[PDB]
Amino acid sequence: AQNPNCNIMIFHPTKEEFNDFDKYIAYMESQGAHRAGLAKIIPPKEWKARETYDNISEILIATPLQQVASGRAGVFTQYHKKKKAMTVGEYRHLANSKKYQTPPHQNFEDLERKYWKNRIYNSPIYGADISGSLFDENTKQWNLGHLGTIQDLLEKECGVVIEGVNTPYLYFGMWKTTFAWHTEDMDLYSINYLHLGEPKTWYVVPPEHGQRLERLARELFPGSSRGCGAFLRHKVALISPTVLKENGIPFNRITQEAGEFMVTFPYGYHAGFNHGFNCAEAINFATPRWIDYGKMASQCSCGEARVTFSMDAFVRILQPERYDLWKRGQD
Numbered sequence: 001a002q003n004p005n006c007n008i009m010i011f012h013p014t015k016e017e018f019n020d021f022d023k024y025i026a027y028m029e030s031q032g033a034h035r036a037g038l039a040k041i042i043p044p045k046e047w048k049a050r051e052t053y054d055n056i057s058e059i060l061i062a063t064p065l066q067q068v069a070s071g072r073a074g075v076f077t078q079y080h081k082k083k084k085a086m087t088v089g090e091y092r093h094l095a096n097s098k099k100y101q102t103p104p105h106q107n108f109e110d111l112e113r114k115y116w117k118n119r120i121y122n123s124p125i126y127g128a129d130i131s132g133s134l135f136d137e138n139t140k141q142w143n144l145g146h147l148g149t150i151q152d153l154l155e156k157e158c159g160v161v162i163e164g165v166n167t168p169y170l171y172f173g174m175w176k177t178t179f180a181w182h183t184e185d186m187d188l189y190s191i192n193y194l195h196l197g198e199p200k201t202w203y204v205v206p207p208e209h210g211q212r213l214e215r216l217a218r219e220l221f222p223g224s225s226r227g228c229g230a231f232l233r234h235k236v237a238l239i240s241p242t243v244l245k246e247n248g249i250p251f252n253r254i255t256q257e258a259g260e261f262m263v264t265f266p267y268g269y270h271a272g273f274n275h276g277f278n279c280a281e282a283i284n285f286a287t288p289r290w291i292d293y294g295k296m297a298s299q300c301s302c303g304e305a306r307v308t309f310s311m312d313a314f315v316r317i318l319q320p321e322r323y324d325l326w327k328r329g330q331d
């Protein structure tokens with residue numbers, strides 16, 4: 001079995017290997033990359049996502065989210081308070097202000113220490129989940145707006161034609177902005193490209209050990225657990241590495257820098273934080289290996305998780321027994 005310790009693997013494809021996305025994902029899996037839940041892909045030196053980032057300031061962040069924490073430093077939840085719209089140029093200035101800027105630090109490890117010590121005492125503002133793309137239309141390799149769609153994969157694998165679309169999302173981050181512990185909708189893959197700015201630190205639990213994380217989360221968030229049998233679908237809970245180590249949960253960590261891709265694999269729980277002003281783009285995708293994960297994915301039916309239009313069909317076709325109850329949660 002390849003990668004039996006479920007370490008995060010880092011790949012350096014050549015320009016020739018960068019042509020065929022599906023084939024390279026399947027290659028990475030042949031080497032065991034999925035066992036970690038997360039992989040890094042460093043693009044060939046010849047590749048670029050677009051020519052420059054000089055003209056992005058007029059993008060609108062219609063609903064910036066202030067991430068307010070409750071709990072203790074290593075075990076907290078966050079809620080998202082909606083703020084007034086602002087442009088990317090306005091947000092960048094805000095991120096760089098004395099109130100919100102990255103503190104002085106020695107290295108990524110010192111910054112990680114400061115994040116876990118101090119996150120809860122601040123409420124950073126995240127421009128998340130903005131439909132759109134920063135890939136140049138002429139970028140033919142690993143262009144996250146030109147991937148094969150999940151609806152077409154389901155149709156190729158299972159023969160059923162379904163409604164829905166699959167488009168990318170932009171994330172504009174600042175110091176301390178935080179992504180809570182989650183897997184993807186329907187336990188899909190994700191791919192994330194860090195277009196610019198400061199790094200993003202990731203934590204990940206191997207898919208084969210995801211239920212260990214779920215059991216800890218039910219212990220640590222006991223009211224949330226009684227409210228919903230899949231409350232990590234709410235994307236609000238954080239647990240620190242120190243706490244994970246104290247409770248014996250297997251995980252790994254890695255820092256993504258500008259110009260790098262990360263792939264999350266089906267049922268790979270992940271969480272993380274931004275180091276400073278940055279912009280990422282991410283999208284879900286599927287492969288044939290996902291289908292079985294999609295069929296077994298948990299679902300939130302309490303009403304909190306509220307998701308896209310396109311998840312309807314996935315539930316309806318892969319999980320027809322759950323469909324009725326899940327749809328009640330969506331309505």
Ligand SMILES: O=C(O)CNC(=O)C(=O)O
Binds near residue numbers: 178192200282
């Ligand atoms: O970058 C972020 O805030 C969150 N991204 C992801 O969870 C992802 O790409 O799967």
Ligand SMILES: [Mg+2]
Binds near residue numbers: 057
């Ligand atoms: Mg612009």
Ligand code: NI
Binds near residue numbers: 182183184190264270
């Ligand atoms: Ni994710």
Ligand SMILES: [Zn+2]
Binds near residue numbers: 231300301302
């Ligand atoms: Zn729920």
